[PDB]
Amino acid sequence: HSSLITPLQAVAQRDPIIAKQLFSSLFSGILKEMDKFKTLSEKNNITQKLLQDFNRFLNTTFSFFPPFVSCIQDISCQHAALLSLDPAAVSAGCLASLQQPVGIRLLEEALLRDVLRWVELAKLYRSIGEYDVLRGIFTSEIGTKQITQSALLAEARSDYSEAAKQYDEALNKQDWVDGEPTEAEKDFWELASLDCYNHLAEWKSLEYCSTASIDSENPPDLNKIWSEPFYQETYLPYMIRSKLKLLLQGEAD
């Protein structure tokens, strides 16, 4: 009546998956067991300390380990407290640890019952293909500007000339007095401009439009691409790719 509990821990340290699923069951079991006594003014602060530790884990980890990442993101999505865990670090964790489709489900359960979650969900679904939910979220919650649908229709069918030539018009809207958008599509217009620049053989405007929006009239391209960690993710690879394809024709430059 005890000779099963000890081989559980004996097989635990052998391979990580069984122990990961064991811990993810056991913590949820004890956390369900604390619901009986320990009344309402305890669970709130206990869960706040818990999510503080989970945010601490996901921020401070440096050696990317996929079963550990999936373990913490699995035990997050199973109670009524940990849903608003971290709409920022979860995407970096699942992208650098190649474990997208558990953090994706955590973000969807977060969006059940709130803009940057959609933004980093777009950066999530950009990793695994899935372009027909990528377009599907850039018309629902990021929008209310009537250039978005007009460029997305010329982008849904591959016609990436008009899909570029109604974005540089949209970027420099001077007054446009009907209300002004948030930054959540100010970046999206530039990013989709980069993408439709890249889908055609057009890098000369692409490098100038990428490297223009970070610095002054002449590029240092020296530390600001390395500082401000948005710039290592978004502006970096299209810039280096465009410079590469532009040099590979044959120049000196």
UniProtKB/Swiss-Prot annotation:
Effect caused by changing G136A: In a lung neuroendocrine carcinoma sample; somatic mutation
Compartment annotation: Nucleus; Nucleus, Nucleolus; Cytoplasm, Cytosol
PTM statement from Swiss-Prot or TrEMBL: Autophosphorylated at two clusters, the T2609 cluster and the S2056 cluster. Autophosphorylation induces a conformational change that leads to remodeling of the DNA-PK complex, requisite for efficient end processing and DNA repair. S-nitrosylated by GAPDH.
Annotated positions of the Phosphoserine modification: S3
TPR repeat spans: 115-143, 144-177
Superkingdom field: Eukaryota
Disease: Immunodeficiency 26 with or without neurologic abnormalities: A form of severe combined immunodeficiency characterized by reduced or absent T and B cells, recurrent candidiasis, and lower respiratory tract infections. Some patients show dysmorphic features, severe growth failure, microcephaly, seizures, and impaired neurological functions.
Family assignment from sequence similarity: Belongs to the PI3/PI4-kinase family.
Function: Serine/threonine-protein kinase that acts as a molecular sensor for DNA damage. Involved in DNA non-homologous end joining (NHEJ) required for double-strand break (DSB) repair and V(D)J recombination. Must be bound to DNA to express its catalytic properties. Promotes processing of hairpin DNA structures in V(D)J recombination by activation of the hairpin endonuclease artemis (DCLRE1C). Recruited by XRCC5 and XRCC6 to DNA ends and is required to (1) protect and align broken ends of DNA, thereby preventing their degradation, (2) and sequester the DSB for repair by NHEJ.
Identification of the protein by name: DNA-dependent protein kinase catalytic subunit
Taxonomic path: Eukaryota, Metazoa, Chordata, Craniata, Vertebrata
Positions spanned in the full protein: 2787 to 3058 of 4128
